[PDB]
Amino acid sequence: RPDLAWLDEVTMTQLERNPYEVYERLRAEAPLAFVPVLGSYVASTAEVCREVATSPDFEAVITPAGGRTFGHPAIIGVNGDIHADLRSMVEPALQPAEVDRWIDDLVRPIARRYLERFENDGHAELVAQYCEPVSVRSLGDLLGLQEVDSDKLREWFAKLNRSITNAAVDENGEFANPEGFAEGDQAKAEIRAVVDPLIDKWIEHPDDSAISHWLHDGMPPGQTRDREYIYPTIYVYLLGAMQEPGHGMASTLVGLFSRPEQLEEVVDDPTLIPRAIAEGLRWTSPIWSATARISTKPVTIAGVDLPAGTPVMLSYGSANHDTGKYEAPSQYDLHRPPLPHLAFGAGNHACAGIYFANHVMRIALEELFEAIPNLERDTREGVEFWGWGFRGPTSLHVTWE
Ligand code: HEM
Ligand SMILES: COc1ccccc1O
């Protein structure tokens, strides 16, 4: 596309460091645009992302780097009967009525455990010391990975993150950094070494862990789903389900620190925490551009005539800064009117864990503000955000008296 010649000079590193300037141009110039370094069309506005995610002429497709990492059948990349089975498999523990039965006794003692390690120090780095551990310990226990240390769960989602966002392609459309997939392969090998013995045991002795239920639920007597059939969805969980609640917590905190009067409001009135989190997810979406859809017939989107079989990356983190929807979207504002947002996606492949994720984040922040009401940002240490596919702060240094 001639007027988008400048996109030829956009780099993967630029998008990872801060994608918002490029995507501000894309939203104005070309809401659906082919980005050469990504080797794909990209949807940048709320209207186009929603249309693609919900269209009857599109279905799920995994990104190239996602496919190289997760294989088949990753719940995010399949459709039809297989997708319906995988959704039936994961949905029971995520049902709102079910989550409300046990989410408090799950998350609150975990939040207290990690808080007790530092709440009297007067300083902490909240990403590593609190947000990520609460996120991975809660979900890890739900899955049946109680014996997998939070440090290890966090290392796995970091490696899987970098692997499935290893999207850069060269002039010929081949991956520019094929060696970047090796650490994804290494994480999967380690995951297998840990989880294979657990699956062995769950096949013979089912329990209330989620992975045990993935093996057994809905199956004929004495049968389980083959481990190869569920492993890619295990990997999906060990990346985003482990990573995103902690990132959403942390981005919410960074935004509140950027509006000190709003931080004070929420500490004083913790019933405002759900609204603070919803704005945090819009303001810096944890899953920023990690999923995609593929057209199943010729379709015209945003004035582009796409052939059948065209992938489109859904850059939801950009759509959540759509100035057709939001005033001054790069500013965190607790008091923004509650509007629809796309941080959980849309359509048949929208996030299955929204209700759970929202409560994990709410409980973590409630406990944090109860334990340390006088939290302040360490204004010497600046907050760097990183990531194009998944985005969040790399650290969050705070102090308190
Ligand atoms: C704040 C935290 C989270 C955010 C922002 C988030 C966001 C998203 C997004 C954007 C997608 C892709 C939707 C699309 O392509 O349209 C997704 C998919 C998914 N998420 Fe969440 N997620 C979060 C936490 C979780 C958790 C904790 C779980 C599990 C307990 C989970 C389970 C899933 C599943 C299973 C899918 C695949 C859905 C499908 O393809 O059918 N998510 N999520
Ligand atoms: C819930 O985990 C994911 C969601 C979207 C893309 C990759 C993931 O691991």
Author numbering: 6 to 406
Quote what the paper states about this structure.
GcoA belongs to the CYP255A family of cytochrome P450 enzymes. Our recent characterization of a two-component P450 enzyme system consisting of a reductase, GcoB, and a P450 oxidase, GcoA, demonstrated that it demethylates diverse aromatic compounds, including guaiacol (which can be derived from coniferyl alcohol and represents the aromatic functionality of G-lignin that must undergo demethylation), guaethol, anisole (methoxybenzene), 2-methylanisole, and 3-methoxycatechol (3MC) with similar or greater efficiency than other O-aryl-demethylases described in the literature. However, GcoAB shows poor reactivity toward syringol, which can be derived from sinapyl alcohol via high-temperature reactions and represents the aromatic functionality of S-lignin that must undergo O-demethylation for further catabolism via ring-opening dioxygenases. In the present study, we hypothesized that substitution of GcoA-F169, which has the closest interaction with the bound substrate, may relax the specificity of the enzyme sufficiently to permit the O-demethylation of S-lignin type substrates.
The closest contact is with GcoA-F169, which forms a hydrophobic interaction with the C6 carbon on the aromatic ring of guaiacol. A broader survey of variants at the GcoA-F169 position (amino acids S, H, V, I, and L in addition to A) confirmed that GcoA-F169A exhibits the best catalytic performance in terms of both specific activity and reaction coupling, although other small side chains (S and V) also permitted reactivity with syringol, suggesting that these may permit syringol to assume a reactive conformation at the heme. Each protein variant also crystallized successfully with guaiacol and the structures showed that the orientation of the bound ligand remained consistent with that of the WT enzyme. Furthermore, comparison of the surrounding active site architecture confirmed no significant deviation from the WT.
